[model samples]
Target: APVRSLNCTLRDSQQKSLVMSGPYELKALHLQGQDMEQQVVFSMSFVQGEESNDKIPVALGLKEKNLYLSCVLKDDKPTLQLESVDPKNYPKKKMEKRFVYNKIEINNKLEFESAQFPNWYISTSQAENMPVFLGGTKGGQDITDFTMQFVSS
Candidate 1:
């Protein structure tokens, strides 16, 4: 099977976890850094099945930050996990995934913003697999295209 594209935006201090539905596998993960000079620190991936869940973290560099996290999602559920903390280093404590569905409108597109990065447009949809991306700006004012794609099953 081929991998699909998934995109998302991080506008909060809390941990962000993406749950993939259907019989699919995660092939890749891509994230767009907020600031022009800012860079991605690190990333992690997890897989949950009827019996257990496993997680793995991938190291990232300043120049190689804007890329994809190679992953393989099987017929089981694969959860794409990410936590934003002090970029200097990965925190000793693991950040828990936070859910914000209550703050989002059902069936409606979602936009996220944070004090650290400001406004951002975000969208996630399942085509052949999953294609998610974050765009727009903060305060719902400016507009920018901060997009990244990951290949998934």
Candidate 2:
């Protein structure tokens, strides 16, 4: 299946960080393994009128029911972290800190490319193991890119 666009925007508890009013695409690809590992990769282009000054390519990897989005930056180092989930499985719902940087500059427009997903175990149970491709609409358009918001600590 092709990438699905959505009207999703990034928001924090304090205020709305980034509002996307353009088109984006999301594609789901199944990874082969004993566990049910799936990858949902998305590419989004910032709207011309937005505050963003760079185009970002984002890719997400789902393993063991955990969702991770990888970000690549030209000025800064690349980073990965957990975005969101059903909450039922993850009781302690908190955005995983960026593993690469201890402190990140907020609202810094960074460009990313050639970012790839890392290999991880899909499932603990090997009996019913199969990667499933799941695609959905995000950020208002079928081919919209995933937007990342950085919050100041």
Candidate 3:
């Protein structure tokens, strides 16, 4: 499968883009003129046999780290965690469901909902510089919707 480099920006008025503060932390902040280096782009690849015509199952790996986004139970609630793994050995490395998310596109943006916890989505804070975690979107779409800019493969 092809690996895609993606840059994600929130759909809200703040226009904050996703970034990595630490090796394991994902946060939303200004990209400073859409600077590619600071955007902390993600490298996404589809998981075989889990692909569908509509909702695609994918593994989102950080461009700068070996960690892949995972939805796991933390304190009894579904939380976004970064699981470190060798990129070349993914999807067959066991417990792959936690690292797979349904990539659903809506109105020109994408919503990455957890495959393990159907209702949970990759979300950020309104306060900015906060850790990106799994959040419920029953309230609305402000934090859940993100516009993806494809940087490269």
Candidate 4:
């Protein structure tokens, strides 16, 4: 099933409590110094949109426009990166994207595994301002137990 809209949450596998959430915005990553009560979402589509460049690192239609998330190795470490241009734009452009503009879908899990630090993953420190760190847990289900529950638009 293709997803039209989504709302995400992060937490333990099933502790009856949410760890964090989706549907976040650029502001969450812009604060640059806070980590309280701020979150965002990772938006994408299985079927490419008409406006897409038809390549990898597809855009998520974010308010900031044409942002994409891609997994890459930084100094031998698995790291998630943001890109403003579609994969086609990489030749002329370089690193200039935000975290929320992308999404990670690994083995049906929300796992953002680090190549350098296998035990670590990408998690928020509240501000989305927090860069990659050694935190977060897998649900042990649902692709590390991640969700992008669809709803009536």
Candidate 5:
């Protein structure tokens, strides 16, 4: 199944709503692996724009059943960088925080914490046209949380 795009939800640890599908959708997902142990990897592509005119490319990643999102060396500082699933190239020993697949389920809240910024969480702020970003605090306040249900066409 090619899961190209999906409607997602975002909520806080306290159960206050942040995103509700508003019907927000995640686009351009390339999936890999089929089992938990095999480690599903998704080279997620997200776009923010008014059509293709000004879309910004961002790939949301994580593997190994939700360990955390991955980061790259920017000016020698680790920062979240989205990229396609280049199996032979990714998972390089140095970049251990490779984005791991966290199987999406209905009404399940997930924390997307990355290394270095362990206190921060990854979550989309608004709906429909949205920007995938790292927000503040872990289980502390708003700006970090997610949930989704698999829908059929």
Candidate 6:
């Protein structure tokens, strides 16, 4: 069974929430003391893919925006990009090609591995107020694990 319009907060191990700094940048910051009411609730949907063991292929979009998380190649490395897409026609063939990520759960946390790059993961930095980036499982010491707090369906 496939799920759609899942609203959740992608809380990192640092206990910060993912928020957009701009149209293209994704950052993790403390949402408690900030006066800004713009809390991010990501709309997620399970895309069309075979259930291979445990990983769930998913497409992530901002609940308040037209943006969807997409992976693109930059400097010969997998990079994260937020692209504006229509929700009405989402999970289309082209969207699946760029937006799909293998969501793997480890313990209570989840790791989003790029389907295009396999081992590269969506990660945040140890420092506060840092842009989210694609991290290599081998080298970079980035925080790839996240606790998905379900906001709504």
> TM-score for every candidate vs. truth?
0.21, 0.19, 0.80, 0.35, 0.38, 0.86
Q: What is the per-residue lDDT of model 4 for residues 1-153, given as tens digits with 9 covering 90 to 100?
A: 333333343331221222222332222233222432243343443323222232222223332335544445568655555545564443221232322222355544444443334444544444433343333354421223333433222
For TM-score, candidate 1 versus 4, the one ahead is 4
* Worst 10 contiguous positions by lDDT, candidate 4: 12-21
lDDT of 6 by residue, 1-153 (tens): 235557888888878788878878888877776533466778887777754666988888887677888889988888998887775766453346668888988878898988877798899888889998888873356789889887745
lDDT of 3 by residue, 40-86 (tens): 66767666436666688777876656788888888898888878887
Candidate 1 worst ten-residue window by lDDT: 46-55
lDDT of each candidate versus the true structure: 0.26, 0.26, 0.70, 0.36, 0.38, 0.79
- Model 2 has an lDDT value of 0.26
After the best TM-score superposition of candidate 1, give how far the Cα of residue 19 lies from its true spot, in angstroms: 2.4
Name the best candidate (by lDDT): 6
Q: Tens digit of lDDT per residue, candidate 5, span 1-153?
A: 222333333333433332112222221121234422221233343422122322222324333222224554567554444454556544332333334222222245555554444445565443333445555554443345554333231
Q: Summarize candidate 1's per-residue lDDT along 62-140 as a digit string, tens digits.
A: 1213323222222442322232335443222222222111122222223322111223233333232243333333334
Clashes of 1: 18
Give the residue spans of candidate 5 off by over 4 A.
1-69, 72-79, 89-95, 98-107, 138-142, 150-153
Rank the models by TM-score, top first.
6, 3, 5, 4, 1, 2
lDDT of 3: 0.70
lDDT of 1 at 34: 47
- Which parts of model 6 have CA positions greater than 4 angstroms off? 1-3, 33-36, 91-94, 138-140
Best by TM-score: 6
> In order, how many clashes per candidate?
18, 16, 0, 7, 8, 0
- Report the C-alpha displacement of residue 36, candidate 6, in angstroms: 7.6
TM-score of 3: 0.80
Candidate 4: pairs in clash: 10-19, 24-40, 24-41, 77-116, 78-115, 108-143, 109-143
